[model samples]
Target chain A: ALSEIETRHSEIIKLENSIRELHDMFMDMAMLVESQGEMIDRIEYNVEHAVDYVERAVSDTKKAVK
Target chain B: SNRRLQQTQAQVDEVVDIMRVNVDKVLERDQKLSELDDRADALQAGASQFETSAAKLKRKYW
Candidate 1:
């Protein structure tokens, strides 16, 4: 009975380690997703600003032509 | 860069999904372990009760 308890305790320890590793992996993935979100946000901002500038330039050119 | 971001997002989602499955499995195992503990406790109690009953029987017979 004592040996059985010891075996079970060891198995629980192993499972706990496996869960901890999975948690760490999950955290790493979450960080990666966060960084990707930041990158996407910056890129979209830049694209929007560029489009706005082009639009203003077209408007100014049309006014000058008129 | 956009393509890379999308690829990374997909990979992250996949990993997250795997993690979720792993967590669920662990939870199930945890519940099973708890049940095992309860069984062990019951077995211990029964063993103690048997010892007590055997002692009474021995005293009465002697």
Candidate 2:
């Protein structure tokens, strides 16, 4: 029975390492997604402010030209 | 201007929602991985203990 089970330790260790690596990868992806969210927020805020300024400038130009 | 603002806000909201979904998925997978790790640990411990017991039994017989 021992002969049949010999050297199984290495296999188990390998499997554990694989699982650890996968767990790390998942965490990394989660962090990247969070960072992407922050980036998107900044971009959206800038777009919103730009639109506001453009609209205000257009209104001011109309009044001045009139 | 309000209409454009609303549209842009809606798009941002959509992206946030998608990211939320992805986060949820990762959480679920993490839980599953945790469970698998627990099982593997248990199995390894059991196998080690059993091997120790078997070796003792063989020495006793000898």
Candidate 3:
């Protein structure tokens, strides 16, 4: 049936479109993972520095008064 | 043929346009994430400066 052939063609077109979308999704995720390595480390280091700074600031302010 | 499937070609155009924007949204995510990544170093430097300044006010350091 010609109708059947065209229907299957439509289905293939739909499948191909989805494949393209999936590849785009994967491309972005790959970039995300690459940045997660060094870029993410900056976040953790800043957090640690903040904690250390607060500790020293608190400790020193205590001495300043006493 | 979808009479239901005979769907107007214009319908397909609108669908493709919406999907293109949707695709761009993902691409946009990657763009913004890369920008943030590039800025991360400067951000860290700025915070580190603040932290060091705070350390100076400390009575002492261990």
Using DockQ as the measure, the top candidate is 3
Q: Give the Å error, residue A53, model 2.
A: 0.5
RMSD of model 2 against the true structure: 36.8
Q: Which ten-residue region of model 1 chain A has the weakest summed lDDT?
A: A57-66
- Candidate 2 lDDT over residue span B1-62, tens digit each: 43554565566556555655776786676666556555555555555555555555545544
Report fnat for all candidates as fractions from 0 to 1.
0.04, 0.00, 0.12
Task: Provide all candidates' interface root-mean-square deviations.
Answer: 40.1, 38.0, 5.5
- Model 2 achieves a DockQ score of 0.01
**Candidates ranked by DockQ:** 3, 1, 2
Q: Whose lDDT is greatest here?
A: 3
How well is each residue in A1-66 modelled by candidate 2, as lDDT tens digits?
575355455544554565565566667777866755654555455545545554554554454445
Candidate 1: segments with Cα more than 4 A from true spot: A61-66, B1-17, B20-62
Give all candidates' CA lDDT scores: 0.57, 0.56, 0.61
- TM, every model: 0.47, 0.45, 0.47
- Backbone Cα, N, C clashes tallied per candidate: 0, 0, 3
lDDT of 1 by residue, A3-56 (tens): 867866665565556656667877765665565565455545554554555555
Assess candidate 2 and give its TM-score to the true structure.
Answer: 0.45
Q: Higher DockQ: candidate 2 or 3?
A: 3
- Candidate 3 local lDDT, residue A64: 55
Where does model 2 exceed 4 Å of error?
B1-62
Task: Evaluate chain B of model 2: give its TM-score.
Answer: 0.61
